[PDB]
Symmetry: D3
Subunit: 157 residues, 6 copies
């Protein structure tokens, strides 16, 4: 009867995220990656692209599924019939804020949040920094799954 | 001859703020809650509303008064004839930044800043997160004074 | 096929620990509380006492069991046929060190470590501080399970 | 009816401590410096010396007095008829631990703890580091009051 | 064969920055201050002004030169024939983010980043806070070089 | 005219230390690894062993030399005719304390301290944790140079 949700904007998903997905998948019967929507623009890839990149990057995880999140994460979590959120912590993570949200979430919906440190090698990657560097000409291909690099290379060019 | 100022945007005031007001009120002869103004919009409640919510939430503190702050906090503080600022520290607080401002304030006006940890139970509440959650349908009534919940419920609906 | 280990010296177990036990128990099929041994003395309660206090404080958690840990936590974890460690994070937690150990543990045994924030109300309790305060005459009964208070009161007197 | 206690081992008192004493003295009607005792040795100066150094370094603060602390700080505080503790925060301060103690102290005795950042120039001085450096031949005279340097020079030699 | 780059927006340069420039200049044969450009506006001083203020504030550092940075800092660094970046760390510094960028930069270009703590006295100054305070009427002249105060006074008025 | 000192107990030296040595060696004309002495015991390897392990692990760094440190690091630094200390920062590093020492060192001897983040892969290794794990049977060979593993294996057995 176990399951966990991994929420995020995944714009785009990185190998740090995938590492977290793999570890959650190894510890819970079912994992749902919840891709949060963007009110307008300001994001790099649209929802369909984000979903595709995540699905394409998680074919080796049979007990994991991708779905679009709407509203409060806790509402999505309880709609999935779960009470756990799994989030990775890495270099640049505003972990103080993650703590605030975790307790707020416990308070309003009884939902637990389990944190896990990302692998050392993916500790400095973030969707935001990967995009910034990629935009300015830097090669971040070793920090992103190939389905993402493929699309990232195409966006540019 | 003692007094302290508790500055903030209080949009809206939370029970974490009230806890700080109560503790400052117990240690200083006079406490002044300074509500900072907003250059345009982007805030949820207007100044009059913010003032009302604070006053209505502090009727049990006779040595406390609410006033609108303008310009540098230190200028307001010295205008009140005081040299102390009391700020609460809680989960999500950018305490590194609070330290920078405290020393900058000491440097330019000789004004001291005393920090106090918020009660554990109100440690994850912030005006910003309360609004975000409230906006998306979450019930944060147990973290805000009733004068605020009353108005928050009315804003929605 | 899920299980997690909650390692510690639990000298004595606090309500913060119990909160963590409850949350791990709600998310994993099986939870094992691993009480680490002490090379000589310097601890307040002996192993038998620690075990008893934990068992007596966890009767409401059927899928949880208490066992004595020996050697590396990861060796104990794999001996239990698991690959997950669940640890609570609270005020005073040397979380930077917990991160170091988590990654070291992942590196040497492939064991994952999931962290969870303790409830706000139990955020300032630690076995060490509870003992220090208790020793000097302070009443920490509201932060410890009754099976522990009973024994703590008896130790003194 | 206001007063605050500044607890510590003050072995020896530094200019960072004096800065805190001065600021507490400017904001509270009465300030009491509570010098905590040492169970045996391991300290550099004995109680009488510590008291003397503090008194000699605070002659310019008429509303401040030095007394020897025994037991829990909160018990000392309430014995002084106060409910406030003032502590300075500086480089090397285990502020996470100070937060734990502040809340524990609030919990057991209703005593408030107000923190203040030390002046930038005294931010890296601590009794411990001053002694370590002094022991190995370093000159830390600019970070300690003269009554302390006088005694420190005499200890050596 | 040694050299280091000190990148930043320097809008405007502060005495904290100058302290870092001086220390880098004392340890490396050649130092290049790289002033990053601003995509549109939102900055206070234009590029020419920023360059002038830095040059005027560094006449005592013969082995230092000012140049305008474009694109990734690492690309600028390697274009200067160097592999080191020197950045100061101070109160308000998002050092967690600096760590992320340092490792990202090492990863993509093999460029090292050396951090140095700013002098205690300039630990609370930042271009942003200096401007904010200056804008509201505060005197921050003791935290900025005279070439900057001259221009800052003229901007206002 | 450039040089830097890398001080430490190196008991034993790890690959994280070597990474720092390599980076310092690439940026300074001369690097001196200063092995600090131990007042009595409590250390695992004796001075001669520590020196040997460091020398054997740094044969690829021609501009680096190993020497035994005595007294204050700053005194050793100035005796080497240098004014720079290079230290690595990693997971578990008490960086708040490193900041205190850096400023104390600047204050008493004018010596600068440059910090560098360790490579992500060696971010969780420390001499202390490597020994603790090694002692209890864990294999930390991938985090230590072979000259150290050779000796570590021999110590045990």
């Amino acid at each position: 009867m176990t399951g966990a949700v991994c929420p995020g904007s995944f714009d785009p998903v990185t190998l740090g995220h995938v590492d977290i997905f793999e570890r959650a998948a190894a510890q819970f019967d079912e994992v749902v990656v919840a891709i949060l929507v963007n009110p307008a623009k300001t994001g790099m890839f649209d929802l369909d692209e984000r979903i595709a990149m995540v699905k394409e990057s998680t074919t080796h995880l049979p007990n994991l599924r991708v779905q679009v999140g709407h509203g409060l994460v806790v509402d999505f979590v309880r709609s999935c019939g779960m009470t756990a959120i799994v989030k990775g912590l890495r270099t640049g993570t505003d972990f103080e804020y993650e703590l605030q949200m975790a307790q707020m979430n416990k308070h309003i919906a009884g939902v637990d949040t389990f944190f896990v440190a990302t692998a050392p090698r993916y500790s400095f990657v973030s969707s935001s920094l990967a995009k910034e560097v990629a935009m300015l000409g830097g090669d971040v291909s070793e920090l992103l799954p190939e389905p993402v690099n493929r699309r990232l290379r195409d966006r540019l060019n």
